[PDB]
Design an enzyme around this catalytic site. Structure first.
Site, PDB file in Angstrom:
ATOM      1  N   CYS A   1       1.613  -2.410   1.698  1.00  0.00           N
ATOM      2  CA  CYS A   1       3.190  -2.471   2.149  1.00  0.00           C
ATOM      3  C   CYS A   1       3.681  -3.762   1.677  1.00  0.00           C
ATOM      4  CB  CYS A   1       3.393  -1.841   3.397  1.00  0.00           C
ATOM      5  SG  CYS A   1       3.940  -0.223   3.139  1.00  0.00           S
TER       6      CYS A   1
ATOM      7  N   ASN B   1       4.189   6.940   4.707  1.00  0.00           N
ATOM      8  CA  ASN B   1       3.575   5.815   4.520  1.00  0.00           C
ATOM      9  C   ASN B   1       2.374   6.010   3.371  1.00  0.00           C
ATOM     10  OD1 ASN B   1       3.402   5.945   8.005  1.00  0.00           O
ATOM     11  ND2 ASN B   1       4.064   4.147   6.835  1.00  0.00           N
TER      12      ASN B   1
ATOM     13  N   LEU C   1      -2.153   4.403   0.666  1.00  0.00           N
ATOM     14  CA  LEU C   1      -1.250   4.455   1.929  1.00  0.00           C
ATOM     15  C   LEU C   1      -1.347   3.254   2.778  1.00  0.00           C
ATOM     16  CD1 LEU C   1      -2.192   5.452   5.160  1.00  0.00           C
ATOM     17  CD2 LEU C   1      -3.771   6.939   3.872  1.00  0.00           C
ATOM     18  N   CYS C   2      -0.331   3.093   3.429  1.00  0.00           N
ATOM     19  CA  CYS C   2      -0.241   1.934   4.161  1.00  0.00           C
ATOM     20  C   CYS C   2      -0.627   1.905   5.693  1.00  0.00           C
ATOM     21  CB  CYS C   2       1.332   1.232   4.145  1.00  0.00           C
ATOM     22  SG  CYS C   2       2.138   0.844   2.686  1.00  0.00           S
ATOM     23  N   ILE C   3      -1.874   1.734   5.958  1.00  0.00           N
ATOM     24  CA  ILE C   3      -2.518   1.822   7.472  1.00  0.00           C
ATOM     25  C   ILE C   3      -3.231   0.438   7.588  1.00  0.00           C
ATOM     26  CG2 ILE C   3      -4.585   2.885   6.456  1.00  0.00           C
ATOM     27  CD1 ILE C   3      -4.413   4.625   9.008  1.00  0.00           C
TER      28      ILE C   3
END
Ligand SMILES: Nc1ncnc2c1ncn2[C@@H]1O[C@H](COP(=O)(O)OP(=O)(O)OP(=O)(O)O)[C@@H](O)[C@H]1O
Ligand SMILES: [Mg+2]
Lengths: 987, 170, 78
Positions: free
Chosen positions: A590, B85, B92-94
């Site tokens: 992100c 997310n 995915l952002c985790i």
């Protein structure tokens, strides 16, 4: 001039920085004595790039000098050492003139030098006189000498010297979440400042404290790992939000004592804290060697002579009375240690010379630049553990006598028989770069592999590049483009013709794809293996091979001024892979794609975009136009199907006809990436948006972006279009003809740029053109090359990263910093490379002796910047057990003969080992599992190992394979899963 | 202590997550080509009847490095699903899959990663949103969000393997 | 009894720890992890020619007052 050739000094600039090399390029260095120690120092200083190098050594070349003087040849015997070495040193660096000082009768000649270096050819009386002149004149003075497996260095940089950067490390930085009126700085959430008490910091973007950001330095009082204090900030205002601290290194003025003063009251820096009691002893011993020479017509103690060694003990005893502060009260003379110094006084050992050659050379560079912390003032060293067992290789006056060979001063320490076993060694060197070149040089001086039963195999698949020349001294400018291993092998054969026909230079990469070349017979024939690698995967691969074949491995590595060595002994120590190193820093996805806050984030984003624009897009098109089932493969591959199809569609839609079309494409991509996409991100998350707690969404690690308005006079906007257009033109085979702003501006100003507007698969696959329409069409994918300044690669990545940095108010970076991060370049300098290679060759002596006492071996860890040297005994291989049977968890394994059937393999382990094999694997493929259904079990249980692999991997075992490694999970006699060694199938 | 290699540790965790007695019913795990130990095809299921993603069978692929578990694995939804997310490419952002708010550590397992994923599926992280429209619809247009999630649940039911029984709701 | 020791990294940074001679190397690594964020699996501590191993104590390596341990690492270039 003030210019630094960045294509030559690239890797070294990342170690020293530009300012340090500017000072170096104004420094004239004089080196006294050009035996092994002097020429090793001169080699590294000339490579570093000082203003000039002057050498003084009018002594005639003798055969024994060739023990470590790698620039002397037998044809030079009788000529002056300085003269015959000057032209060879000059070839190392065309930027550095190398001159010979004819006579040192007039000491005032030293006034023209900034650093004077006195090696082992200068008497202690002359060192004191020279140091007195240098000290009183402000000339930096460094001395050094090696005696067998012993050595020392002395540094005297004068009454006034300023250190500008003590460590050369990257300044710590971090984001601040609060600054209380008392100056308590709190880090943003789970972030550590990494500061210590006494550091200084400056601040930026601290809203509410204004003048706090003006560059003023604040002294750090550490409170915990997440907070520190800088003193009251009430005078500056009241903290609101934001803030970034940056550590600043402050100058430190220091003062050095003269050599005469330091002989009676030395300030020691230790090379091995485990031997710290020896420094004071060797300090008296080295002085006593000089007193011995005064009393014996300039002669050293005779080799292995007890009469001379007893006289040296008496000289040391008398010296301790005259210099009582050296040993201290109640401390007796270590007679055994002094005796070994006398025994080895005439010894000249390549590994020791390499160690001090690299260390002293780096001290020279510190004295020119104020970069790194100088040694202050004395350091002594010994590698007495390198001595072989006297029972196998007795050392006496007969076995160490000279035999009229270049190795005579090595025989003096180790004896003839030991040197012969060194010659008869069979060794593999993996890699022929910085460590490789130094390693081959040491081996050439060792005569290693020159005997009738010895040889050297060195392999490297890489070619010579310009920046390599700064620290790979076997290579010349005329060699750029040639294969490293072949050029290196020829260079060392010229240095020692005894290696002619004894070096097998190969150009193969070591790894899983070359096991037919480096097969079982190849590895099993070796005595030991030495790494010279620059990546972890290759080290891991070699380590596993040495474990498989039970071969000793000598491992080493460097990073700027830091270095390490590790010894791996079959059935004794753990292997390289037994322990873990800190991984490379990663970027959360992100942060990379949406919320960057450091230049590292925009460089990674830019590098990824570069690969997508000019490499992945071209390869997808070439597969779509040549593979008949490509559209079906990607639909069920699958991943990002929408991305691959749009990539091919776009690549075949706006096909450029000329370079002007490529300019337009790049300008439109600029608008998309740095204007439209930024507006779309702000459209969903406005600048004044709030989170759950009512706090601003764009706070802390999130920097509110702003869209870019294209400005051709902004260097980053311009070069984005230039490089982007040039790289697109390359993909589509569009030729060319320094970019002209007016020519680009005219094309762009006539473009109509679509405005921003805020916002199934079967249609995209139908919109693709038929491959028959594009018969013969091909795109040329880009292969990232960071070291070609004309290919627009770094230009694009820098400009693309800096445009994104402008979006997020991140400070832009020049091409050299971007190349460093995007190219993953490892900072490197020849000084650390030579030193670390010397330490490896001091451990190599222990391999020749087949030492089984783990305490005799030493792993090394160095940082020449501090300077720090530390050593540790290797870790023993851990032991395990299954069904009470003990095994070595590293080196033990099951050996099975023949292409056995799976059922017989399982049945043998039940009877012979009491193990129930539950799962079996070959490489990454699962071959057998006890929980398979009865259908798969019956099919696999009856197959031999080779057919079982073919059933699973659909590839046959090639004929060159003679052994197979199998991994198994098994249950013990109590039905519990237990760790077990691997299996070797002997086909 | 017990320094197991990557393939052995992956095989033991694979065996436990497919054992008819210890396998977690929320994950249908199989190896690529029923042989490759370092890439797993996983069907993620949400058994919580009070979750919006209940009833779906979301295919995904997990790839493990050669130094497992000393480096995090890679996870990707195949195909990409609608979630605040998750990016359009399936990644995915985790935090649990990032190394160096709990990050990756060698004590983490495939089970704990998958558990952290189904939790992020029910409770998306809006402070670190991958990409809209799922993130903006999660806050502004909740009814559009559910309609997009429900349409993604029914779209994932076509990927249910033949003869596979969906586990009962919790 | 209680004593003050130092831990210096290969880059030059110094860490101070109030410890007892009976503390285990495992406990020292746990404190270095909280102070520096370095996992104990990645900590290479050396002192007086030995590499400190789990299961031992500080007194087992003859570590006294004002003793300095060294956090070292392996490098990948060259
Ligand atoms: N698997 C491998 N098999 C054989 N040689 C290898 C392997 N991996 C790396 N090498 C070689 O090891 C050497 C490392 O040395 P070094 O990094 O100093 O040179 P370089 O990579 O050319 O320089 P730079 O890193 O500054 O570009 C290189 O010459 C490289 O080709
Ligand atoms: Mg390299």
């Amino acid at each position: 001039a003030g210019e630094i050739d960045e294509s030559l000094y690239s890797r070294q600039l990342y170690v020293l920085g530009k300012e340090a090399m500017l000072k170096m390029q104004t420094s004239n260095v004089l080196i006294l004595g050009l035996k092994g120690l002097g020429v090793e120092i001169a080699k590294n200083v000339v490579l570093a790039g000082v203003k000039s190098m002057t050498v003084f050594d009018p002594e005639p070349v003798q055969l024994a000098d060739l023990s470590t003087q790698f620039f002397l040849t037998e044809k030079d015997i009788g000529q002056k050492r300085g003269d015959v070495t000057r032209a060879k040193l000059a070839e190392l660096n065309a930027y550095v003139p190398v001159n010979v000082l004819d006579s040192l009768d007039d000491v005032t000649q030293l006034s023209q030098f900034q650093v004077v270096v006195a090696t082992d050819t200068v008497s202690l009386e002359d060192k004191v006189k020279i140091n007195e002149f240098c000290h009183s004149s402000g000339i930096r003075f460094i001395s050094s000498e090696t005696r067998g497996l012993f050595g020392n260095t002395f540094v005297d940089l004068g009454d006034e010297f300023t250190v500008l950067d003590p460590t050369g490390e990257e300044p710590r930085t971090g984001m601040v979440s609060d600054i209380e009126p008392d100056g308590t700085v709190t880090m943003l959430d789970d972030n550590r400042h990494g500061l210590e008490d006494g550091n200084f910091v400056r601040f930026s973007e601290v809203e509410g404290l204004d003048k706090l950001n003006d560059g003023t330095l604040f002294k750090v009082e550490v409170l915990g790992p997440f907070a520190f204090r800088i003193g009251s900030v009430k005078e500056y205002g009241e903290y609101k939000k934001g803030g970034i601290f940056t550590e600043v290194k402050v100058p430190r003025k220091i003062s050095f004592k003269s050599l005469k003063q330091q002989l009676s009251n030395p300030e020691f820096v230790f090379s091995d804290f485990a031997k710290f009691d020896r420094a004071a002893q060797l300090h008296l011993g080295f002085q006593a060697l000089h007193q011995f020479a005064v009393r014996h017509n300039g002669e050293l103690p005779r080799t292995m002579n007890d009469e001379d060694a007893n006289e040296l003990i008496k000289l040391v005893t008398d010296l301790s009375v005259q210099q009582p502060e050296v040993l201290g009260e109640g401390v007796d003379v270590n007679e055994d240690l002094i005796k070994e110094l006398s025994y080895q006084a005439r010894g000249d050992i390549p590994g020791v010379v390499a160690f001090f050659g690299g260390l002293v050379a780096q001290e020279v560079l510190k004295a020119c630049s104020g970069k790194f912390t100088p040694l202050k003032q004395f350091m002594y060293f010994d590698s007495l553990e390198s001595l072989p067992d006297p029972k196998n290789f007795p050392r006496n006056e007969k076995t160490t006598q000279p035999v009229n060979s270049r190795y005579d001063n090595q025989i003096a320490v180790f004896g003839l028989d030991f040197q012969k076993k060194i010659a008869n060694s069979k060794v593999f060197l993996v890699g022929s770069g910085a460590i490789g070149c130094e390693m081959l040089k040491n081996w050439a001086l060792l005569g290693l592999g020159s005997g009738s039963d010895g040889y050297i195999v060195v392999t490297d698949n890489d070619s010579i590049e310009k920046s390599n020349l700064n620290r790979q001294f076997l290579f010349r400018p005329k060699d750029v483009g040639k294969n490293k291993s072949e050029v290196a092998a020829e260079a060392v054969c010229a240095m020692n013709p005894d290696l002619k026909g004894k070096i097998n230079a190969k150009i193969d990469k070591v790894g899983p794809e070359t096991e037919e070349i480096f097969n079982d017979s190849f590895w099993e024939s070796l005595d030991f293996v030495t790494n010279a690698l620059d990546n972890v995967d290759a080290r891991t691969y070699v380590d596993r091979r040495c474990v498989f074949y039970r071969k000793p491995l000598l491992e080493s590595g460097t990073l700027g001024t830091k270095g390490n060595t590790q010894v791996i002994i079959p059935r004794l120590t753990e292997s390289y892979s037994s322990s873990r190193d800190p991984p490379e820093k990663s970027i959360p996805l992100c942060t990379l794609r949406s919320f960057p806050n450091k230049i590292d984030h925009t460089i990674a984003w830019a590098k990824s975009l570069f690969q997508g624009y000019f490499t992945d897009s071209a390869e997808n098109v070439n597969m779509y136009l040549t593979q008949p089932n490509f559209v079906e493969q990607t639909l069920k591959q699958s991943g990002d199907v929408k991305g691959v199809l749009e990539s091919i569609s776009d690549s075949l839609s706006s096909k450029p006809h000329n370079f002007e079309d490529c300019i337009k494409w790049a300008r439109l991509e600029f608008e998309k990436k740095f204007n439209h996409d930024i507006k779309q991100l702000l459209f969903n998350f406005p600048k004044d948006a709030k989170t759950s707690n009512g706090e601003p969404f764009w706070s802390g690690a999130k920097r509110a972006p702003t869209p870019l308005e294209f400005d051709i006079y902004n260097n980053d906007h311009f070069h984005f279009v230039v490089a982007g257009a040039s790289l697109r033109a390359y993909n589509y085979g569009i030729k060319s003809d320094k970019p002209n702003v007016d020519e680009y501006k005219s094309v762009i100003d006539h473009m109509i740029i679509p405005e921003f507007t805020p916002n199934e698969i079967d249609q995209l696959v139908s919109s693709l053109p038929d491959p028959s329409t594009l018969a013969g069409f091909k795109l040329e994918p880009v292969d990232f090359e960071k070291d070609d300044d004309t290919n627009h690669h770094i230009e694009f990545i820098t400009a693309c990263s800096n445009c994104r940095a402008q979006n997020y108010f991140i400070e832009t970076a020049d091409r050299q910093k971007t190349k460093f991060i995007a190219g993953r370049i490892i900072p490197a300098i020849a000084t650390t490379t030579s030193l670390v290679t010397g330490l490896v060759n001091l451990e190599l002596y222990k391999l020749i002796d087949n030492k089984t006492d783990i305490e005799q071996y030493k792993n090394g860890f160095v940082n020449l910047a501090l300077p720090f040297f530390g050593f540790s005994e290797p870790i023993a291989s851990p032991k395990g057990e299954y069904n009470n049977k003990k095994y070595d968890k590293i080196w033990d394994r099951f050996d099975i003969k023949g292409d056995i059937k799976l059922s017989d393999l399982i049945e043998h382990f039940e009877k012979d080992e009491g193990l129930e094999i539950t799962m079996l694997s070959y490489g990454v493929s699962l071959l057998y599992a006890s929980f398979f259904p009865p259908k798969k079990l019956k099919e696999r249980l009856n197959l031999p190992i080779t057919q079982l692999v073919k059933l699973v991997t659909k590839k046959d075992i090639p004929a060159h394979v003679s052994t197979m490694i199998l991994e198994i999970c098994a249950d013990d006699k109590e039905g519990e899963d237990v760790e077990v060694p691997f299996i070797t199938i002997h086909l | 202590s017990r320094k197991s290699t990557a393939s052995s540790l992956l095989l033991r965790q694979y065996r436990e997550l497919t054992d008819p007695k210890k396998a977690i019913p929320s994950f249908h795990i199989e190896l690529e080509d029923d042989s490759n130990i370092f890439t797993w095809n996983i069907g993620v299921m949400v058994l919580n009847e009070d979750s919006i993603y209940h009833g779906g069978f979301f295919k995904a692929q997990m790839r493990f490095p050669e130094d497992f578990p000393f480096s995090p694995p890679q996870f990707r939804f195949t195909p990409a699903i609608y979630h605040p997310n998750v990016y359009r490419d399936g990644r995915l952002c985790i935090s649990i899959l990032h190394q160096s708010a709990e990050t990756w550590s060698p004590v983490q397992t495939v089970e704990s990663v998958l558990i952290s994923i189904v939790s992020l599926l029910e409770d998306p992280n809006i402070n670190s949103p991958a990409n809209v429209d799922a993130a903006v619809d999660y806050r502004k247009n909740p009814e559009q969000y559910k309609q997009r999630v429900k349409m993604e649940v029914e779209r994932s039911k076509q990927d249910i393997p033949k003869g596979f029984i969906m586990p009962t709701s919790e | 009894g209680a004593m003050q020791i130092f831990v210096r990294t290969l880059t030059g940074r110094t860490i101070t720890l109030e410890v007892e001679s009976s503390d285990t190397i495992d406990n020292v690594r746990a404190r270095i992890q909280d102070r520096e964020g370095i996992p104990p699996d990645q900590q290479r501590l050396i002192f007086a020619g030995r590499q400190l191993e789990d299961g031992r104590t500080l007194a087992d390596y003859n570590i006294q007052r004002e003793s300095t341990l060294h956090l070292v690492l392996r490098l990948r270039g060259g």
